[PDB]
A paper describes a structure:
However, in the vast majority of prokaryotes, including M. tuberculosis, [name] and CoaC are encoded by a single gene to produce a fused bifunctional enzyme ([name]). [name] converts 4′-phosphopantothenate to 4′-phosphopantetheine in three steps. Transcriptional silencing of individual genes of the CoA biosynthetic pathway of this pathogen identified [name] as uniquely bactericidal within the CoA pathway, highlighting it as a good candidate for drug discovery.
Screening for crystallisation conditions allowed us to find a different [name] containing condition that gave excellent resolution (1.8 Å). The small differences (RMSD = 1.147 Å) in overall structure of [name] dimers in the full-length MsmCoaBC and the MsmCoaB crystal structure solved at 1.8 Å can be attributed to artefacts of crystal packing. Hence this crystallisation system could be used to validate [name] inhibitors binding outside of the [name] site. Nevertheless, a flexible loop (residues 362–377) that covers the 4′-phosphopantothenate site, when this substrate binds to the enzyme, can be seen in our MsmCoaB structure, extending away from the active site. A superposition of our MsmCoaB dimer structure with MsmCoaBC shows the loop extending towards the CoaC active site. This long loop (15–16 amino acids) is present in all CoaBCs and it is possible that it helps channelling the substrate from the [name] to the CoaC active site. This loop contains a motif “K-X-K-K”, which is widely conserved in bacteria, with few exceptions, and each lysine either interacts directly with the triphosphate group of [name] or through highly coordinated waters. Also observed is the coordination of a cation by the triphosphate group and D281. While magnesium or manganese are the favoured cations for [name] activity, calcium is observed in our structures instead, due to the high concentration present in the crystallisation condition.
Residue numbers in the entry:
A (entry chain A): 184 to 293, 300 to 364, 374 to 412
B (entry chain B): 184 to 412
The structure:
Amino acid sequence: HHDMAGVKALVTAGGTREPLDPVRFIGNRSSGKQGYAVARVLAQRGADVTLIAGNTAGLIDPAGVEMVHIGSATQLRDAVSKHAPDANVLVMAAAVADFRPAHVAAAKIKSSIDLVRNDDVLAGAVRARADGQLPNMRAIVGFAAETGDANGDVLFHARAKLERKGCDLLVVNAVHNDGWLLSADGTESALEHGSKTLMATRIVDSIAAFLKSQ
Amino acid sequence: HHDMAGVKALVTAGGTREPLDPVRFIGNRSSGKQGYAVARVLAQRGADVTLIAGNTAGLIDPAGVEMVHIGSATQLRDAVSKHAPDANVLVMAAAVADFRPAHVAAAKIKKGASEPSSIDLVRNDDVLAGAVRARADGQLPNMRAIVGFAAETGDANGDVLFHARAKLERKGCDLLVVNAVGENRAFEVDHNDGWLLSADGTESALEHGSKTLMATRIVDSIAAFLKSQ
Ligand SMILES: Nc1ccn([C@@H]2O[C@H](COP(=O)(O)OP(=O)(O)OP(=O)(O)O)[C@@H](O)[C@H]2O)c(=O)n1
Ligand SMILES: Nc1ccn([C@@H]2O[C@H](COP(=O)(O)OP(=O)(O)OP(=O)(O)O)[C@@H](O)[C@H]2O)c(=O)n1
Ligand SMILES: [Ca+2]
Ligand SMILES: [Ca+2]
Protein backbone atom coordinates (compact mmCIF):
# COMPACT_ATOMS: atom_id res chain seq x y z
CA HIS A 1 0.00 0.00 0.00
CA HIS A 2 1.20 3.51 0.95
CA ASP A 3 3.31 2.78 4.03
CA MET A 4 5.54 5.84 3.47
CA ALA A 5 2.58 8.29 3.57
CA GLY A 6 3.51 11.35 5.62
CA VAL A 7 7.27 10.64 5.43
CA LYS A 8 9.54 13.37 4.05
CA ALA A 9 12.48 11.68 2.34
CA LEU A 10 15.67 13.37 1.17
CA VAL A 11 17.64 11.36 -1.40
CA THR A 12 21.01 12.09 -3.00
CA ALA A 13 21.99 10.33 -6.23
CA GLY A 14 24.58 10.53 -9.00
CA GLY A 15 28.25 11.45 -8.89
CA THR A 16 29.74 14.78 -7.97
CA ARG A 17 32.10 16.77 -10.22
CA GLU A 18 35.01 18.60 -8.61
CA PRO A 19 36.13 21.47 -10.87
CA LEU A 20 39.69 22.01 -12.03
CA ASP A 21 38.71 24.98 -14.21
CA PRO A 22 35.45 26.06 -15.95
CA VAL A 23 35.68 23.10 -18.36
CA ARG A 24 37.42 20.20 -16.55
CA PHE A 25 36.70 18.30 -13.33
CA ILE A 26 37.36 15.14 -11.37
CA GLY A 27 34.30 12.92 -11.83
CA ASN A 28 33.24 9.34 -11.29
CA ARG A 29 31.39 6.60 -13.14
CA SER A 30 28.23 6.53 -10.99
CA SER A 31 25.05 6.44 -13.10
CA GLY A 32 22.64 7.48 -10.37
CA LYS A 33 20.20 4.76 -11.40
CA GLN A 34 19.97 3.02 -8.04
CA GLY A 35 19.46 6.28 -6.16
CA TYR A 36 16.80 7.45 -8.62
CA ALA A 37 15.10 4.05 -8.26
CA VAL A 38 14.87 4.46 -4.46
CA ALA A 39 13.44 7.98 -4.88
CA ARG A 40 10.82 6.64 -7.34
CA VAL A 41 9.79 3.78 -5.04
CA LEU A 42 9.61 6.08 -2.00
CA ALA A 43 7.30 8.45 -3.93
CA GLN A 44 5.24 5.55 -5.18
CA ARG A 45 4.71 4.46 -1.56
CA GLY A 46 3.50 7.91 -0.51
CA ALA A 47 6.61 9.74 0.66
CA ASP A 48 7.21 13.43 -0.01
CA VAL A 49 10.54 13.01 -1.83
CA THR A 50 13.26 15.56 -2.54
CA LEU A 51 16.03 14.24 -4.83
CA ILE A 52 19.39 16.02 -4.85
CA ALA A 53 21.04 14.88 -8.09
CA GLY A 54 24.65 15.21 -9.23
CA ASN A 55 25.87 13.77 -12.55
CA THR A 56 23.78 10.91 -13.95
CA ALA A 57 23.61 8.80 -17.08
CA GLY A 58 21.03 11.10 -18.72
CA LEU A 59 18.26 10.05 -16.33
CA ILE A 60 14.72 11.42 -16.40
CA ASP A 61 13.36 13.24 -13.32
CA PRO A 62 11.10 10.77 -11.46
CA ALA A 63 7.46 11.87 -11.48
CA GLY A 64 6.22 13.56 -8.32
CA VAL A 65 9.75 14.06 -6.91
CA GLU A 66 11.15 17.52 -6.14
CA MET A 67 14.43 17.84 -8.06
CA VAL A 68 17.51 19.69 -6.78
CA HIS A 69 20.58 19.70 -9.04
CA ILE A 70 24.14 20.06 -7.73
CA GLY A 71 27.62 19.88 -9.16
CA SER A 72 30.31 19.44 -6.49
CA ALA A 73 30.51 17.59 -3.18
CA THR A 74 30.43 20.95 -1.38
CA GLN A 75 27.30 21.98 -3.29
CA LEU A 76 25.77 18.63 -2.37
CA ARG A 77 26.68 19.26 1.28
CA ASP A 78 25.01 22.67 1.21
CA ALA A 79 21.91 21.28 -0.51
CA VAL A 80 21.61 18.52 2.11
CA SER A 81 21.99 21.10 4.88
CA LYS A 82 19.33 23.30 3.27
CA HIS A 83 16.81 20.46 2.95
CA ALA A 84 17.60 18.53 6.15
CA PRO A 85 15.49 20.38 8.81
CA ASP A 86 12.19 18.69 7.98
CA ALA A 87 13.39 15.41 6.42
CA ASN A 88 12.43 12.15 8.13
CA VAL A 89 14.60 9.86 5.99
CA LEU A 90 18.01 10.65 4.47
CA VAL A 91 19.15 8.28 1.71
CA MET A 92 22.78 9.00 0.72
CA ALA A 93 23.08 7.15 -2.57
CA ALA A 94 25.30 9.75 -4.25
CA ALA A 95 28.91 8.91 -5.13
CA VAL A 96 30.34 11.94 -3.32
CA ALA A 97 33.94 12.87 -4.13
CA ASP A 98 36.30 12.39 -1.17
CA PHE A 99 38.70 15.01 -2.56
CA ARG A 100 38.58 18.17 -4.65
CA PRO A 101 41.24 20.25 -6.42
CA ALA A 102 42.67 22.79 -3.99
CA HIS A 103 42.68 25.58 -6.62
CA VAL A 104 40.18 26.19 -9.42
CA ALA A 105 41.65 28.04 -12.39
CA ALA A 106 39.71 31.11 -13.51
CA ALA A 107 40.44 30.30 -17.17
CA LYS A 108 41.09 27.19 -19.23
CA ILE A 109 44.33 25.36 -18.41
CA LYS A 110 46.70 25.42 -21.40
CA SER A 111 50.96 21.25 -13.35
CA SER A 112 50.33 18.76 -10.54
CA ILE A 113 46.81 19.02 -9.09
CA ASP A 114 46.82 19.56 -5.33
CA LEU A 115 43.86 18.00 -3.48
CA VAL A 116 41.93 18.75 -0.28
CA ARG A 117 39.28 16.67 1.48
CA ASN A 118 35.56 17.32 1.07
CA ASP A 119 33.27 17.10 4.07
CA ASP A 120 31.71 13.70 4.83
CA VAL A 121 28.03 14.59 4.42
CA LEU A 122 26.67 11.25 5.65
CA ALA A 123 28.82 11.37 8.80
CA GLY A 124 27.81 15.00 9.34
CA ALA A 125 24.14 14.01 9.35
CA VAL A 126 24.76 11.19 11.80
CA ARG A 127 26.61 13.54 14.15
CA ALA A 128 24.08 16.35 13.77
CA ARG A 129 21.26 13.98 14.63
CA ALA A 130 23.22 12.65 17.60
CA ASP A 131 23.85 16.23 18.73
CA GLY A 132 20.11 16.95 18.71
CA GLN A 133 20.12 19.06 15.55
CA LEU A 134 17.91 16.74 13.45
CA PRO A 135 15.02 15.66 15.71
CA ASN A 136 12.77 14.84 12.71
CA MET A 137 15.38 12.49 11.14
CA ARG A 138 14.23 8.93 11.88
CA ALA A 139 16.39 6.98 9.39
CA ILE A 140 19.80 7.74 7.87
CA VAL A 141 20.80 5.37 5.05
CA GLY A 142 24.28 5.10 3.57
CA PHE A 143 25.49 3.32 0.43
CA ALA A 144 28.85 1.66 -0.12
CA ALA A 145 30.69 -0.18 -2.88
CA GLU A 146 33.03 -2.66 -1.21
CA THR A 147 35.41 -5.31 -2.51
CA GLY A 148 37.62 -7.87 -0.83
CA ASP A 149 41.33 -7.13 -0.99
CA ALA A 150 44.61 -7.88 0.78
CA ASN A 151 43.27 -6.17 3.94
CA GLY A 152 40.05 -8.13 4.31
CA ASP A 153 37.12 -9.81 2.68
CA VAL A 154 34.21 -7.81 1.26
CA LEU A 155 31.91 -8.34 4.26
CA PHE A 156 34.67 -7.40 6.71
CA HIS A 157 35.12 -4.04 4.94
CA ALA A 158 31.34 -3.49 4.67
CA ARG A 159 30.78 -4.11 8.39
CA ALA A 160 33.69 -1.80 9.24
CA LYS A 161 32.13 0.90 7.07
CA LEU A 162 28.77 0.53 8.87
CA GLU A 163 30.54 0.84 12.23
CA ARG A 164 32.55 3.91 11.21
CA LYS A 165 29.68 5.77 9.57
CA GLY A 166 27.22 5.09 12.38
CA CYS A 167 24.19 5.22 10.08
CA ASP A 168 21.04 3.17 10.64
CA LEU A 169 21.26 1.15 7.42
CA LEU A 170 24.13 0.58 5.00
CA VAL A 171 23.25 -0.59 1.49
CA VAL A 172 26.30 -2.51 0.27
CA ASN A 173 27.10 -3.38 -3.32
CA ALA A 174 29.84 -6.00 -3.69
CA VAL A 175 31.91 -4.98 -6.72
CA HIS A 176 25.75 -9.85 -10.92
CA ASN A 177 27.10 -10.36 -7.39
CA ASP A 178 24.57 -9.92 -4.60
CA GLY A 179 24.92 -7.10 -2.10
CA TRP A 180 23.92 -6.68 1.53
CA LEU A 181 21.63 -4.63 3.73
CA LEU A 182 23.48 -4.03 7.02
CA SER A 183 21.53 -2.63 9.98
CA ALA A 184 22.91 -0.76 12.97
CA ASP A 185 21.43 -3.45 15.24
CA GLY A 186 23.59 -6.12 13.57
CA THR A 187 20.98 -7.57 11.23
CA GLU A 188 22.50 -8.55 7.87
CA SER A 189 20.33 -9.31 4.90
CA ALA A 190 21.45 -10.45 1.47
CA LEU A 191 20.47 -8.04 -1.31
CA GLU A 192 19.77 -10.10 -4.39
CA HIS A 193 20.86 -8.85 -7.80
CA GLY A 194 17.72 -8.01 -9.74
CA SER A 195 16.39 -4.98 -11.55
CA LYS A 196 17.11 -1.59 -10.02
CA THR A 197 13.39 -1.39 -9.16
CA LEU A 198 13.33 -4.72 -7.30
CA MET A 199 16.45 -3.78 -5.34
CA ALA A 200 14.94 -0.36 -4.58
CA THR A 201 11.80 -2.10 -3.30
CA ARG A 202 13.93 -4.23 -0.98
CA ILE A 203 15.84 -1.15 0.24
CA VAL A 204 12.65 0.79 0.92
CA ASP A 205 11.11 -2.27 2.65
CA SER A 206 14.08 -2.19 5.03
CA ILE A 207 13.64 1.55 5.66
CA ALA A 208 9.94 1.06 6.39
CA ALA A 209 10.68 -1.81 8.79
CA PHE A 210 13.29 0.30 10.58
CA LEU A 211 10.85 3.19 10.95
CA LYS A 212 8.27 0.83 12.44
CA SER A 213 10.81 -0.46 14.91
CA GLN A 214 11.41 3.01 16.18
CA HIS B 1 20.52 16.10 -52.46
CA HIS B 2 23.17 13.53 -51.49
CA ASP B 3 26.32 15.58 -52.06
CA MET B 4 28.34 13.48 -49.63
CA ALA B 5 27.76 10.26 -51.61
CA GLY B 6 30.97 8.27 -51.91
CA VAL B 7 32.69 10.14 -49.08
CA LYS B 8 33.95 7.98 -46.20
CA ALA B 9 33.89 10.02 -43.01
CA LEU B 10 35.57 9.30 -39.68
CA VAL B 11 34.05 11.41 -36.90
CA THR B 12 35.10 11.66 -33.27
CA ALA B 13 32.66 13.02 -30.72
CA GLY B 14 32.24 13.42 -26.99
CA GLY B 15 34.69 14.08 -24.22
CA THR B 16 37.34 11.64 -23.10
CA ARG B 17 37.77 10.40 -19.51
CA GLU B 18 41.29 10.04 -18.12
CA PRO B 19 41.29 7.44 -15.31
CA LEU B 20 42.68 8.03 -11.83
CA ASP B 21 41.54 4.56 -10.65
CA PRO B 22 38.70 2.19 -11.74
CA VAL B 23 35.98 4.66 -10.68
CA ARG B 24 37.37 8.23 -10.89
CA PHE B 25 38.69 10.21 -13.84
CA ILE B 26 39.49 13.64 -15.22
CA GLY B 27 36.61 14.63 -17.52
CA ASN B 28 35.01 17.62 -19.21
CA ARG B 29 31.49 18.96 -19.69
CA SER B 30 31.16 18.24 -23.43
CA SER B 31 28.02 16.33 -24.33
CA GLY B 32 29.06 14.96 -27.75
CA LYS B 33 25.79 16.20 -29.26
CA GLN B 34 27.33 18.56 -31.81
CA GLY B 35 29.65 15.86 -33.12
CA TYR B 36 26.79 13.36 -33.21
CA ALA B 37 24.81 15.93 -35.23
CA VAL B 38 27.66 16.28 -37.74
CA ALA B 39 27.88 12.49 -38.11
CA ARG B 40 24.12 12.29 -38.55
CA VAL B 41 24.04 15.02 -41.23
CA LEU B 42 26.96 13.39 -43.08
CA ALA B 43 25.11 10.06 -43.22
CA GLN B 44 21.82 11.69 -44.21
CA ARG B 45 23.67 13.23 -47.18
CA GLY B 46 25.13 9.92 -48.36
CA ALA B 47 28.45 9.60 -46.55
CA ASP B 48 29.69 6.26 -45.17
CA VAL B 49 30.22 7.33 -41.55
CA THR B 50 32.25 5.77 -38.73
CA LEU B 51 31.73 7.51 -35.37
CA ILE B 52 34.30 7.17 -32.58
CA ALA B 53 32.35 8.12 -29.46
CA GLY B 54 33.68 9.15 -26.06
CA ASN B 55 31.60 9.99 -22.99
CA THR B 56 28.20 9.78 -24.70
CA ALA B 57 26.40 6.90 -22.97
CA GLY B 58 23.00 8.46 -23.04
CA LEU B 59 22.98 9.64 -26.67
CA ILE B 60 21.19 7.75 -29.44
CA ASP B 61 23.50 6.12 -32.00
CA PRO B 62 22.98 7.98 -35.31
CA ALA B 63 21.13 5.84 -37.82
CA GLY B 64 23.34 4.14 -40.40
CA VAL B 65 26.61 5.02 -38.64
CA GLU B 66 29.21 2.47 -37.53
CA MET B 67 29.84 3.05 -33.82
CA VAL B 68 33.26 2.76 -32.14
CA HIS B 69 33.35 3.34 -28.38
CA ILE B 70 36.43 4.64 -26.53
CA GLY B 71 37.14 5.86 -23.00
CA SER B 72 40.39 7.86 -22.75
CA ALA B 73 42.33 10.14 -25.09
CA THR B 74 44.85 7.36 -25.68
CA GLN B 75 42.09 4.93 -26.63
CA LEU B 76 40.70 7.60 -28.97
CA ARG B 77 44.18 8.00 -30.49
CA ASP B 78 44.43 4.26 -31.13
CA ALA B 79 40.92 4.11 -32.62
CA VAL B 80 41.69 6.98 -34.99
CA SER B 81 44.92 5.23 -36.00
CA LYS B 82 42.98 2.03 -36.73
CA HIS B 83 40.22 3.67 -38.73
CA ALA B 84 41.87 6.66 -40.44
CA PRO B 85 43.30 4.61 -43.38
CA ASP B 86 39.70 4.01 -44.54
CA ALA B 87 38.57 7.67 -44.38
CA ASN B 88 38.36 10.51 -46.91
CA VAL B 89 37.35 13.05 -44.23
CA LEU B 90 38.39 13.19 -40.58
CA VAL B 91 36.09 15.28 -38.38
CA MET B 92 37.73 15.78 -34.97
CA ALA B 93 34.78 17.06 -32.93
CA ALA B 94 35.75 15.26 -29.72
CA ALA B 95 36.73 17.19 -26.60
CA VAL B 96 40.02 15.33 -26.16
CA ALA B 97 41.73 15.64 -22.78
CA ASP B 98 45.11 17.39 -22.98
CA PHE B 99 46.41 15.63 -19.86
CA ARG B 100 45.98 12.33 -18.08
CA PRO B 101 47.00 11.28 -14.57
CA ALA B 102 50.53 9.90 -14.56
CA HIS B 103 49.55 6.93 -12.34
CA VAL B 104 46.34 4.89 -12.49
CA ALA B 105 45.53 3.11 -9.24
CA ALA B 106 44.55 -0.55 -9.46
CA ALA B 107 41.78 0.09 -6.91
CA LYS B 108 39.78 3.17 -5.99
CA ILE B 109 41.97 5.47 -3.92
CA LYS B 110 40.89 5.20 -0.29
CA LYS B 111 40.12 8.13 2.00
CA GLY B 112 42.96 7.84 4.47
CA ALA B 113 43.74 10.20 7.33
CA SER B 114 47.01 11.71 6.06
CA GLU B 115 47.15 14.52 3.51
CA PRO B 116 45.65 13.61 0.12
CA SER B 117 48.25 12.95 -2.56
CA SER B 118 48.46 15.37 -5.49
CA ILE B 119 47.77 14.12 -9.02
CA ASP B 120 50.71 14.39 -11.40
CA LEU B 121 49.71 15.02 -15.02
CA VAL B 122 51.24 13.98 -18.31
CA ARG B 123 50.42 15.30 -21.79
CA ASN B 124 48.31 13.18 -24.09
CA ASP B 125 49.21 12.90 -27.77
CA ASP B 126 47.60 15.48 -30.07
CA VAL B 127 45.49 13.14 -32.18
CA LEU B 128 44.51 15.79 -34.75
CA ALA B 129 48.13 16.92 -35.14
CA GLY B 130 49.14 13.27 -35.47
CA ALA B 131 46.70 12.80 -38.34
CA VAL B 132 47.98 15.94 -40.10
CA ARG B 133 51.55 14.68 -39.84
CA ALA B 134 50.73 11.19 -40.97
CA ARG B 135 49.02 12.61 -44.06
CA ALA B 136 52.01 14.90 -44.68
CA ASP B 137 54.31 11.86 -44.39
CA GLY B 138 52.30 10.02 -47.05
CA GLN B 139 50.59 7.55 -44.73
CA LEU B 140 47.00 8.70 -45.46
CA PRO B 141 46.69 9.00 -49.27
CA ASN B 142 42.87 8.81 -49.15
CA MET B 143 42.53 11.65 -46.62
CA ARG B 144 41.09 14.66 -48.45
CA ALA B 145 39.91 16.88 -45.59
CA ILE B 146 40.94 17.10 -41.93
CA VAL B 147 38.55 19.14 -39.78
CA GLY B 148 39.34 20.42 -36.30
CA PHE B 149 36.98 21.93 -33.73
CA ALA B 150 37.82 24.52 -31.10
CA ALA B 151 36.10 26.54 -28.39
CA GLU B 152 37.67 29.98 -28.24
CA THR B 153 37.07 32.94 -25.95
CA GLY B 154 38.47 36.43 -25.85
CA ASP B 155 40.86 37.12 -23.00
CA ALA B 156 43.54 39.66 -22.14
CA ASN B 157 45.72 38.33 -24.99
CA GLY B 158 43.19 38.57 -27.83
CA ASP B 159 39.67 38.10 -29.14
CA VAL B 160 38.10 34.88 -30.43
CA LEU B 161 39.15 35.35 -34.06
CA PHE B 162 42.75 36.14 -33.11
CA HIS B 163 43.03 32.91 -31.12
CA ALA B 164 41.12 30.85 -33.71
CA ARG B 165 43.23 31.90 -36.71
CA ALA B 166 46.36 31.11 -34.75
CA LYS B 167 45.04 27.65 -33.88
CA LEU B 168 44.15 26.84 -37.52
CA GLU B 169 47.57 27.65 -38.94
CA ARG B 170 49.11 25.91 -36.02
CA LYS B 171 47.14 22.66 -36.24
CA GLY B 172 47.58 22.51 -40.01
CA CYS B 173 44.07 21.12 -40.61
CA ASP B 174 41.97 22.00 -43.70
CA LEU B 175 39.10 23.51 -41.70
CA LEU B 176 38.64 24.73 -38.12
CA VAL B 177 35.08 24.90 -36.68
CA VAL B 178 35.18 27.60 -34.01
CA ASN B 179 32.56 27.74 -31.23
CA ALA B 180 30.06 25.31 -32.71
CA VAL B 181 28.75 25.28 -29.13
CA GLY B 182 25.62 26.28 -27.28
CA GLU B 183 22.10 24.97 -27.58
CA ASN B 184 20.29 28.10 -28.72
CA ARG B 185 17.92 27.88 -25.78
CA ALA B 186 15.97 30.46 -23.84
CA PHE B 187 18.22 32.66 -21.66
CA GLU B 188 21.37 31.35 -23.36
CA VAL B 189 23.38 34.34 -24.56
CA ASP B 190 24.72 34.35 -28.13
CA HIS B 191 28.18 35.96 -28.31
CA ASN B 192 28.14 35.80 -32.16
CA ASP B 193 31.55 34.24 -32.08
CA GLY B 194 31.14 31.18 -34.24
CA TRP B 195 33.36 30.76 -37.28
CA LEU B 196 34.29 28.37 -40.05
CA LEU B 197 37.98 28.99 -40.86
CA SER B 198 39.55 27.48 -43.98
CA ALA B 199 43.25 26.89 -44.57
CA ASP B 200 43.02 28.99 -47.76
CA GLY B 201 42.12 32.12 -45.77
CA THR B 202 38.35 31.98 -46.24
CA GLU B 203 36.46 32.82 -43.04
CA SER B 204 32.68 32.42 -42.71
CA ALA B 205 30.49 33.15 -39.76
CA LEU B 206 28.78 30.23 -38.09
CA GLU B 207 25.41 31.29 -36.75
CA HIS B 208 24.51 29.90 -33.37
CA GLY B 209 21.30 28.04 -34.07
CA SER B 210 20.28 24.46 -33.39
CA LYS B 211 22.80 21.65 -33.40
CA THR B 212 21.24 20.43 -36.63
CA LEU B 213 21.58 23.81 -38.31
CA MET B 214 25.21 24.16 -37.26
CA ALA B 215 25.95 20.59 -38.39
CA THR B 216 24.41 21.43 -41.77
CA ARG B 217 26.62 24.52 -42.07
CA ILE B 218 29.69 22.50 -41.07
CA VAL B 219 28.99 19.75 -43.61
CA ASP B 220 28.25 22.40 -46.25
CA SER B 221 31.73 23.77 -45.56
CA ILE B 222 33.31 20.32 -45.88
CA ALA B 223 31.52 19.78 -49.19
CA ALA B 224 32.71 23.13 -50.49
CA PHE B 225 36.27 22.25 -49.50
CA LEU B 226 36.10 18.85 -51.20
CA LYS B 227 34.72 20.43 -54.36
CA SER B 228 37.44 23.11 -54.31
CA GLN B 229 40.03 20.34 -54.64
N1 LIG C 1 32.45 13.09 1.18
C1 LIG C 1 31.52 12.13 1.26
C2 LIG C 1 31.80 10.83 0.86
C3 LIG C 1 30.81 9.85 0.93
N2 LIG C 1 29.55 10.19 1.36
C4 LIG C 1 28.56 9.14 1.59
O1 LIG C 1 29.17 8.08 2.31
C5 LIG C 1 28.76 6.83 1.78
C6 LIG C 1 29.94 6.17 1.08
O2 LIG C 1 31.08 6.31 1.89
P1 LIG C 1 32.44 5.59 1.41
O3 LIG C 1 32.94 6.27 0.18
O4 LIG C 1 32.15 4.13 1.18
O5 LIG C 1 33.28 5.79 2.75
P2 LIG C 1 34.64 6.58 2.87
O6 LIG C 1 34.77 7.10 4.28
O7 LIG C 1 34.80 7.67 1.84
O8 LIG C 1 35.65 5.34 2.73
P3 LIG C 1 36.44 4.93 1.39
O9 LIG C 1 37.94 5.05 1.63
O10 LIG C 1 36.10 3.49 1.10
O11 LIG C 1 36.01 5.78 0.23
C7 LIG C 1 27.71 7.10 0.72
O12 LIG C 1 26.46 7.04 1.39
C8 LIG C 1 28.04 8.51 0.30
O13 LIG C 1 26.90 9.16 -0.23
C9 LIG C 1 29.32 11.45 1.87
O14 LIG C 1 28.24 11.70 2.42
N3 LIG C 1 30.28 12.43 1.77
N1 LIG D 1 45.08 15.80 -27.28
C1 LIG D 1 44.28 16.34 -28.19
C2 LIG D 1 43.66 17.56 -27.96
C3 LIG D 1 42.69 18.01 -28.85
N2 LIG D 1 42.51 17.35 -30.03
C4 LIG D 1 41.75 17.99 -31.12
O1 LIG D 1 42.21 19.31 -31.29
C5 LIG D 1 41.11 20.17 -31.56
C6 LIG D 1 40.92 21.17 -30.44
O2 LIG D 1 42.16 21.62 -30.02
P1 LIG D 1 42.21 22.62 -28.77
O3 LIG D 1 41.87 21.88 -27.51
O4 LIG D 1 41.22 23.74 -28.97
O5 LIG D 1 43.72 23.11 -28.95
P2 LIG D 1 44.91 22.69 -27.95
O6 LIG D 1 46.15 22.31 -28.72
O7 LIG D 1 44.47 21.58 -27.02
O8 LIG D 1 45.12 24.07 -27.16
P3 LIG D 1 44.28 24.47 -25.85
O9 LIG D 1 45.12 24.26 -24.61
O10 LIG D 1 43.88 25.93 -25.99
O11 LIG D 1 43.01 23.65 -25.75
C7 LIG D 1 39.86 19.33 -31.56
O12 LIG D 1 39.56 19.02 -32.89
C8 LIG D 1 40.27 18.10 -30.79
O13 LIG D 1 39.52 16.99 -31.21
C9 LIG D 1 43.21 16.19 -30.30
O14 LIG D 1 43.06 15.62 -31.39
N3 LIG D 1 44.07 15.67 -29.36
CA1 LIG E 1 34.75 7.62 -0.42
CA1 LIG F 1 42.55 21.31 -25.40
